[PDB]
Every structure is written in structure tokens, then in C-alpha cells.
């Protein structure tokens, strides 16, 4: 009852490692073993669709845009924290990337179950995540930089 | 049912800001508003005693050593993750500090209640926290750099 998720850099198309998912009594733990990411904090969320392909919007290309918006099974239409209920269930703690571009700090999502994640996608943004739609939408994560489909 | 914790740099004796504690259905959230910390990830745990004073050990001074060891109400005598039960209940997610020395990323501790924290101390280390006693004890947090007593 743990799954392996292969993550790919959306810009380069190359693998950046994997993320292992596990279920415990307090929620789902995401344990990253990634590399080649920019140091700092990055938005980290489950997205709705099971794809990492691009999408299009007003004539411009959206890397990993086919993955849809944030997982939001309760139709909240709001971005928030991992421990608040009236926002996307997909909202995870932000992912920390070391000066050496590695991401190994595991994080917990108390509102998710492992069973419901199958078929969705894990997204790593460029920006961080202040867990609010202000001053920028979706926690200010901005562009999608790494993505993997949960199988 | 939120408390304010004033945090002090143990080396300089000066204030570094505060941490607000809150209780929700998923555990206790620590929301930092700190500054003047080294960038990177730092060990972050509740310690047993209600003091931030120094201690002594084999003739050398331990900054914030009077706060005791990690909060460990189940007598596990092991350092682990915030979502694993056979380790110190005091074990929190690591605290992220920006390049500008600020700490504002909130973290959740699903195993703690607000009521039980009164009288203990919040500790911020120098090192990080791999949530293991290997290869270094207590997640490799090492020296204590900032501390505050929960009132
Ligand atoms: Cu996202
Ligand atoms: Cu500690
Ligand atoms: Zn969201
Ligand atoms: Zn510990």
C-alpha cells in the first residue's frame, strides 16, 4: 500500500527521480527522492487529471497543463492549507529543495487517502506556496516544472 | 485556543520573533514569524522542560540545555517522524528558513494537542532533521540556536 511515482522535468523531459507514497493513521506521506530542482520552496499539489502532457490557453503553451487544476473533490474552488477543509484536498505542504538541487524532506497530507490518489497527477511548481489565492492565485506556485502520474 | 510563543536566539540573547500555535482537527499547527535565522532546514522539536536557560555537560556549556531532551510522554527514547508513533511526540516537521533568514512556512504535528504543550519548550536547532538517530543522534539537529517556553 505504497506507490512509486516517477517524476519528470516538464521543461527538459528528463527524469528527476521519484516520490514514494504511503498511508499511515495520520494521512498520506510523500517521501521525495528527487534531484535537479531549483533550491528553495516549491508549490506541491495533486492535480485533477492523470496526465503530464501540455495544454493550451489563449494560444500559449502550458507545460503539464493537461493535468488540470488542483484536485478538489469537494468543489471548494479555493486554494488553502493541507489542514484546512474548505479548499482543494489536493493542497500539500510545500517541497523543500536543497542548495544542491535535491528534494528529500518528506511531508504529510492529513486529508488524503492513498486509495483516492490513483489516476491523478503530482505537480511541482516553480514558485512556492503561501497557501492562499492572494496575492497570487494558487499560492503563487506559477509555472509547472515537474510532474508525475499516480499509478 | 492559540498561544503566542516568543522565540529567542540563544547565542545572542535577542528576540527572533514568535510562533503561533493553533489546534485543528488534524493536530497542532505551528505558524512561524521569525527572522535572523540561517537559511536552510533546521531541527524543530518540543523539548521536555519549561526553560531556555543553559545547562552543563562534562564541563562544557549547552545553550538552551536546561530545556531537557525531546518531549517523550510515551517513553520511546527514539527520534523519528511527526507521523510515526514509537518516537518522541515532540518531533515536529523541520522549519524552513529563507535566504533572507526569515521563517514563515507553517507546519503540522498530527500527534500533539495544544493542551499538552503548556510548560514545554519549542527548540530550533542549527542542523536539519532526517528524523532518525542515524547517522547522527536526534536527526542531526546538533546545537540549539533558538528557544521559547510555551505559556
Ligand atoms: Cu499545482
Ligand atoms: Cu530539539
Ligand atoms: Zn490548491
Ligand atoms: Zn526527537
Q: From the candidates A25, A39, A83, which should be mutated to test the interface with B, based on the most B CB atoms within 10 A?
A: A83
- Interfacial residues of A (vs B; Cβ cutoff 8 Å): 24-27, 29, 40-41, 81-85, 93-94, 96, 98-99, 105-108, 110-111, 131
A7 DSSP β-pair partners: A17
**Grid cell locating A54:** 501540455
- Report CA A139 to chain centroid distance, whole Å: 12
> Annotated binding residue at A120?
no
Contacts of residue A27 in chain B, CB cutoff 8 Å? 26, 83, 110
B139: left (phi over 0), alpha (psi -120 to 50) or beta: left
- Print burial letters for B104-115: b (CB count within 10 Å at least 16), e (below 16): bbbbbbbbbebe
Q: From the candidates B30, B43, B83, which should be mutated to test the interface with A, based on the most A CB atoms within 10 A?
A: B83
Can you tell me the distance from the alpha carbon of B79 to that of B92, in angstroms, rounded to the nearest whole number? 10
Contacts of residue B94 in chain A, CB cutoff 8 Å? 96, 105
> Annotated binding residue at A42?
no
Q: Does the domain formed by B1-151 have CATH 2.40.110.10? A: no
Q: Cα dihedral angle (B61, B57, B17, B80), rounded to 10 degrees?
A: 150
**Grid cell locating A101:** 538541487
A55 DSSP β-pair partners: A62
- Print burial letters for B8-23: b (CB count within 10 Å at least 16), e (below 16): bbbeeeeebbbbebeb
Can you tell me the distance from the alpha carbon of B8 to that of B51, in angstroms, rounded to the nearest whole number? 12
> Annotated binding residue at B131?
no
Can you tell me the distance from the alpha carbon of A18 to that of A33, in angstroms, rounded to the nearest whole number? 6
Q: Do A26 and B83 touch (CB under 8 A)?
A: yes
Q: What is the DSSP letter of A28?
A: E
Dump the DSSP string for A70-104. B--TT-------TT-SSS-TTBPPPEEE-TTS-B-
Whole-angstrom CA distances from A108 to A6, A88, A122, B96, B106 are 19, 15, 14, 15, 13
Contacts of residue A97 in chain B, CB cutoff 8 Å? none
Q: What is the DSSP letter of B134?
A: S
Can you tell me the distance from the alpha carbon of B125 to that of B68, in angstroms, rounded to the nearest whole number? 14
Please provide the distance, in angstroms rounded to a whole number, between the alpha carbons at the two ends of chain B: 12
Backbone angles phi, psi at B130, to 5 degrees: -90, 15
**B118 to chain A, closest Cα gap in Å:** 22
Dump the DSSP string for B10-75. TTT--EEEEEEEEEETTEEEEEEEE-S--SEEE-EEEESSS----EEETTEEETTGGG-SB--TT-
Length of chain B: 151
Amino acid at each position: 500500500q505504497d506507490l512509486t511515482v516517477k517524476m519528470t522535468d516538464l521543461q527538459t523531459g528528463k527524469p528527476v527521480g521519484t516520490i514514494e507514497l504511503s498511508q499511515n493513521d495520520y494521512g498520506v506521506v510523500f517521501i521525495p527522492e528527487l534531484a535537479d530542482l531549483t533550491p528553495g520552496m516549491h508549490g506541491f499539489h495533486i492535480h485533477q487529471n492523470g496526465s503530464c502532457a501540455s495544454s493550451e490557453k489563449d494560444g500559449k503553451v502550458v507545460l503539464g497543463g493537461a493535468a488540470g487544476g488542483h484536485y478538489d473533490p469537494e468543489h471548494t474552488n479555493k486554494h488553502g492549507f493541507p489542514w484546512t477543509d474548505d479548499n482543494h484536498k489536493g493542497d500539500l505542504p510545500a517541497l523543500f529543495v536543497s542548495a544542491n538541487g535535491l528534494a528529500t524532506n518528506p511531508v504529510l497530507a492529513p486529508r488524503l487517502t492513498l486509495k483516492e490518489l490513483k489516476g491523478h497527477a503530482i505537480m511541482i511548481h516553480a514558485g512556492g506556496d503561501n497557501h492562499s489565492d492572494m496575492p497570487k492565485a494558487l499560492g503563487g506556485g506559477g509555472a509547472r516544472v515537474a510532474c508525475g502520474v499516480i499509478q
